[PDB]
């Protein structure tokens, strides 16, 4: 199957540089143009540039917004794609996606990566504090509070992802240069506390991995 995976995202100081990578598999890489697209949190997609395929000599083109500042390259020996970003500023804070572009016939971005989040800021990396949210009657709702971290993102799963439905993870809110979010999960009263419920939190920027078991007070 076709796979596209971005990496290299994270925190970078205003004025600094950062290079993203996009690893692909499951298709003849050299046949395809490849594009980079970005998206500031809550805003529209923006096309940044592409690098053409073999038939077209692997030449590059850029949007006016980034031409002269961002550089796209590819490694055809490893089927990977790169975006070099220079002189970063706040407007560059965004999720960056690589996408499989033109193959000489089709006009479509048929495949996209999961994207990688870039934050341009002078604020320091801070790992989250993670606190269990236990109650105090048919369904029971539990939660985890993920407080005081920077930058985004963090991920919250429940029971290593085996608890999927009945979960709500609330968008982080920034206050005083630190983010806070929470996640709720609602399970049958019979399953808890008789069975264990655990939230798993990860904060990539600080390599933080946290398991917090929700125990009755």
């Amino acid at each position: 199957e076709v796979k596209l995976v971005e990496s290299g995202g994270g925190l970078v100081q205003p004025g600094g540089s950062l290079r993203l990578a996009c690893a692909t598999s499951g298709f003849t890489f050299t046949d395809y143009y490849m594009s980079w697209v970005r998206q500031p949190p809550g805003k529209a997609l923006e096309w940044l540039g592409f690098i053409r395929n073999k038939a077209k000599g692997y030449t590059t083109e850029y949007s006016a917004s980034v031409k002269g500042r961002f550089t796209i390259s590819r490694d055809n020996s490893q089927s990977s794609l790169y975006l070099q970003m220079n002189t970063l500023r706040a407007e560059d804070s965004a999720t960056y996606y690589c996408a499989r572009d033109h193959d000489g016939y089709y006009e479509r971005f048929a495949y996209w990566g999961q994207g990688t989040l870039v934050t341009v800021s002078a604020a320091a990396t801070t790992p989250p504090s993670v606190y269990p949210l236990a109650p105090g009657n048919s369904m029971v709702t539990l939660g985890c509070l993920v407080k005081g971290y920077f930058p985004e993102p963090v991920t919250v799963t429940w029971n290593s992802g085996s608890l999927s439905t009945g979960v709500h993870t609330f968008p982080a809110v920034l206050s005083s240069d630190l983010y806070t979010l929470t996640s709720s999960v609602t399970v049958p009263s019979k399953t808890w506390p008789s069975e264990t419920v655990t939230c798993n939190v990860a904060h990539p920027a600080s390599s933080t991995k946290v398991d917090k078991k929700i125990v009755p007070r």
């Binding site: 594009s35 697209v37 529209a44 997609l45 923006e46 096309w47 592409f50 083109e61 949007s63 996606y97 572009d101 033109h102 089709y106 006009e107 479509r108 971005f109 048929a110 996209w112 990566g113 999961q114 994207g115 504090s129 606190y131 269990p132 949210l133 236990a134 109650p135 105090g136 709702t141 939660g143 509070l145 407080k147 709500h168 993870t169 609330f170 968008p171 982080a172 809110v173 206050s175 806070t180 979010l181 929470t182 709720s184 609602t186 007070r217």
Partner: protein
Amino acid sequence: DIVMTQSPSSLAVSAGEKVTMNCKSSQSLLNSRTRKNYLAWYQQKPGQSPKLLIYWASTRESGVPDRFTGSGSGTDFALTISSVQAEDLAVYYCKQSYNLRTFGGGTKLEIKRADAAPTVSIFPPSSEQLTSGGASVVCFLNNFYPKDINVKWKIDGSERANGVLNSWTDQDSKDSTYSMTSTLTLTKDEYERHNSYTCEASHKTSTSPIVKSFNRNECX
């Protein structure tokens, strides 16, 4: 130098109803040589990557439901959903590839459903947090509609507005409801000076507020 504009910016439609969204280009996208319009539509569900729905204006990508139809030519295009489903909640983007590529600004599609009252849950601070000198009280207001809702916090019966942060989820793709979290943060010192902590939710679904409370003396 091709400007892409979409309308509406947003709208909401009930399940089963028709929807039309429009995409305008500042110049024709009709490639005279290949006889095709270089215009594609993408769907981005909450928290997901964009997914291809339509390309060449009207060609539906395999695996994309028949209810999605792309139409139009030249400078004007549309995406029509014949019978909206709850899972169709998303931002829809058009994109020209006639000259490099350019995305429109997007159309946010939300789903209209029957009003639903929130399920409210309150949670006292954890001992770990208190030990560290902080005190967060959390209230979840889950699965309600419409999105507009009010929360007020009461400490020993008196309202407090300071130190409260609110966060709504995007609409749910299966039941079309919204949820919200309200978090009241206090110092431990201040937290320990009062007993009753109350989270009050007022929503159009009732003239009586939904109230959840805990007393510190009862062990949070």
